Symmetry: D2
Subunit: 267 residues, 4 copies
């Protein structure tokens, strides 16, 4: 197994279409022992994760909660056993209030809303590294989920801005993590049909935004030399696992693109 | 004159070493009629700007103040005269609480501090465009000040993250501005010895941070094929003026580097 | 005038739709005194340039000819007068054999053809700098024409590869030029309907390539926040002039995008 | 094993310090069945590769030889057995005549020399893909070796230009390879003390170039958050193997950096 013997914390599961659900599944398939964290709806998350190939402890983590973050390392240690540390950490957490996305004008997002989204989507990558690095082994790996923000695009609006901050945060986390012998990287994924993504295509954030995201997805598959299947999160789960393994040991502060090769092609 | 007949709003003057002071001076030298905005210490700013080659109205603008932003367009119109619009806008505003910079550990910056810095340094670029676009002429130009955040670096910490967000904001502002026939760009400048920069070199944010910033500056000049003079803001003021002129009419959502060519050289 | 008193060498005029024709026209409009170089069809080029607002000496320059390059500085000095030097140099030269473009398979371009195209399109930027730097004044500016090659695209094939090499050459030329107090930069332009471009849209390199280039152009204008007019080379001529002026004095080894802002927008 | 059952062609072994020697070793350690290609000194290469953990057929391949390339697919099929195809291809080939590197002035490299280096170092990536794609399985992977050319640097000169072309070639190869269900990527490695690299540090290309390369290496390790060991090629061999595996299945036309994280850090 690719991750035999590794202890890995996976955040961000909320449904069975969550990217983190598939990261967790593939990780277990490859021999990893997991600890999960979940936000708010813990009964739902437990029920969802019962479907994973192996059992895994579920800890509550609201990334905006200082107390949750302060106690996290202790709770993880309790879950995996004193004297054991984590080898891997997956950050698969993102959020932006509706005012910062969709057909709501870019200029009309109130800073308080933008700031909440940047807190959850970018700052929390640093918050989690701070909480967990003291309990990680040398050779460890921290991975977060990215959506390539190097160009602006319709609809994504302030979430794209938050991803830009996240990529910058990642390079700083790499500096800190390096002192523990730990890597920090992002996986920039193509669009994936999660429940939220489907809602948006279905017009949940405005018809115009729905149409733009649908077009975005179609152009993505078209220019990807090996195609892109927005209904299949497995290729991104495998990529996250590659970064958690020992097979990219000299890569840190970096971004790995699991996007079908769309970002390197113009037409 | 390069800017003959143009009406230009310049924010960000606080002392005579402010980059915006030099932007304003060169702009006036090239025929621009200016409106200035200042934060907090208005008597100081008025006294400082009395030294500019021509007179210019000074309006108060706290970029975190909704009321200031809501009234800004009216106050500018009053200052330049009904029926006249702006041709140019300069955003030269940046701030990050001390906890987000220097030898204070990256992980120890509290989100409230980071969020204030991102508000002032990144979000406010959008806030100003929102306030001013309704009073800009086609062919107009909005320019903000950037410090290349594509790589992480010691000491700059969360301010670098804020610049990353700003570059992302700029690309979105370009989309909105385009509808008014207005461009939006950033000038990424080399390090400039402002009062704050001198304080930091002098150890104001920790000796270790001071030493790193001093080394950063020295390597900058070394690899710049035409050198870099951190004591001379004129080359960046000229670059900002180039973007306010009619001579880069097909450039928008972009970053122009006024850095001596340091960023394109490795050693 | 923007270029009052400047002596500028402009290569690359072959017809009145040549980008270099418009660079030359705008430069003269702004007070520059020009020396032109032309390849092969000198009688045609003289006849074409008679239409420029002012007269300008025409020197022959085949960029693949060592003798032409060896004698170039002397011939320019003769044309502008002993004791005078150039302030500006415009490289607007590009070529790729048909086998390296269009519907001819990428893999089927013979190296001899690719190498000719890279010689003319990339290496010659260095060849010209070598020839002319000894006769340039401090504060001088060398500018070449680029087409953004950071992503692959249909039809452009090996010409895109040649532009990639050119951008790399430019950064090295900046290093050498810096020793003379001279800048070196590229202008990455949007697609322009030159005679060759029209021929290709018209199917000259295959119907499939024609269709792709036409689609490329249409998407370009669509995502450009201020639009893109492929029939109007003036916005790029103005940008080249901005780089030849004294208004971007701290930019070197760099790329300025005159593309309507298309490259910074995804959809 | 990571590459159990995979048939992989590895070019570029010339000594036991060759990066390709270590790629081949790790690949065999992970269950790959190899076919090797070698240039010129075949007796030397056979003797060197006898030290690999398993036996592997050695085919001659001069990448500038049309006949070698024309017959390559047949010779590989003969070596691995009719009805079997390759799952992987490693391009670890690079060369630049001395005139294009070191203290020899950048401007003094004759085009014939530059063109030879670009032929071997960049064009041949396409030559090999053309030869081998007809004998690759869906899900296959082509990998080439890169040295990050995004910024200019002392000494590397025209080899850096050749790497720039190579990165561009890679994106085009991805387009062609995609039609076979095959990926194409580069690994951008940190500096590695091969025999040639040691010779250069030792002054083989000029004392000034030796000093610059030594400084380059030292700064590399310094800014790498997890360090860089130029004497250890294993971390890059592992990275190449990661790309040959099934664990980055949605990455193509891309560059993976195995550089200790040096390129994402400024100081
Ligand atoms: N779906 C896509 O097209 C796509 C593409 C690229 C990257 N991503 C990124 O992948 C990551 C996972 O998103 P997803 O698409 O799987 O959506 P998702 O809704 O399934 O998962 C997002 C998770 O973030 C959690 N979260 C929100 N606020 C939180 C907080 N305060 N504390 C802790 N957790 C919180 C939610 O509970 C949820 O579990 C996100 O960072 C997203 O931006 C998604
Ligand atoms: N100095 C450098 O090395 C350097 C390099 C690149 C970019 N920059 C950028 O240039 C810009 C100008 O900075 P500077 O170096 O001239 O420093 P400065 O201190 O002279 O100017 C910063 C200005 O921002 C203003 N400001 C802070 N909070 C504000 C708020 N709430 N509302 C309105 N204004 C507010 C201050 O009053 C001050 O006038 C900044 O964006 C800075 O990041 C500086
Ligand atoms: N047209 C576009 O869409 C576009 C877009 C971006 C960049 N560019 C670049 O702009 C530059 C000018 O091209 P253009 O579009 O004006 O086409 P053009 O045909 O009008 O000009 C190209 C010039 O290169 C010259 N040339 C070819 N081989 C030469 C050699 N051996 N020695 C000297 N000169 C030689 C030709 O004589 C011609 O004058 C080229 O580098 C081109 O790649 C063009
Ligand atoms: N050593 C480094 O610091 C470093 C760093 C990054 C990337 N790289 C790249 O890694 C690759 C391998 O280089 P290396 O460092 O292992 O050096 P090396 O000398 O060990 O290997 C280079 C190989 O290229 C082969 N070659 C040269 N001309 C050829 C031709 N005509 N046909 C077929 N093969 C030919 C040589 O025989 C040799 O086997 C190169 O592409 C190099 O640029 C090296």
């Amino acid at each position: 197994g690719l991750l035999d013997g590794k202890r890995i914390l996976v955040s961000g599961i909320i449904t069975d279409s969550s990217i983190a659900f598939h990261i967790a599944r593939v990780a277990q398939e490859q021999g990893a022992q997991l600890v999960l964290t979940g936000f708010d709806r813990l009964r739902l998350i437990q029920r969802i994760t019962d479907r994973l190939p192996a059992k895994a402890p579920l800890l509550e983590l609201d990334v905006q909660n200082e107390e949750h973050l302060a106690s996290l390392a202790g709770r993880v240690t309790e879950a995996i056993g004193a004297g054991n540390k984590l080898d891997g950490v997956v950050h698969s957490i993102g959020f932006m209030p509706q005012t910062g996305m969709g057909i709501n004008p870019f200029f009309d997002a109130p800073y308080a809303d933008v700031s909440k989204g940047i807190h959850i989507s970018a700052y929390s990558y640093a918050s989690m590294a701070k909480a967990l690095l003291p309990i990680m082994n040398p050779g460890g790996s921290i991975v977060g989920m990215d959506f390539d923000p190097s160009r602006a695009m319709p609809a994504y609006n302030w979430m794209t801005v938050a991803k830009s901050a996240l990529e910058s945060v990642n390079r700083f986390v790499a500096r800190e993590a390096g002192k523990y012998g730990v890597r920090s990287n992002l996986v920039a994924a193509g669009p994936i049909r999660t429940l939220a993504m489907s809602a948006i295509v279905g017009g949940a954030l405005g018809e115009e935004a729905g149409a733009q995201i649908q077009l975005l997805e179609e152009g993505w598959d078209q220019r990807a030399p090996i195609g892109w299947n927005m209904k299949d999160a497995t290729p991104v789960a495998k990529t996250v696992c590659a970064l958690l393994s020992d097979w990219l040991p000299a890569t840190t502060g970096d971004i790995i693109y699991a996007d079908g090769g769309a970002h390197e092609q113009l037409l």
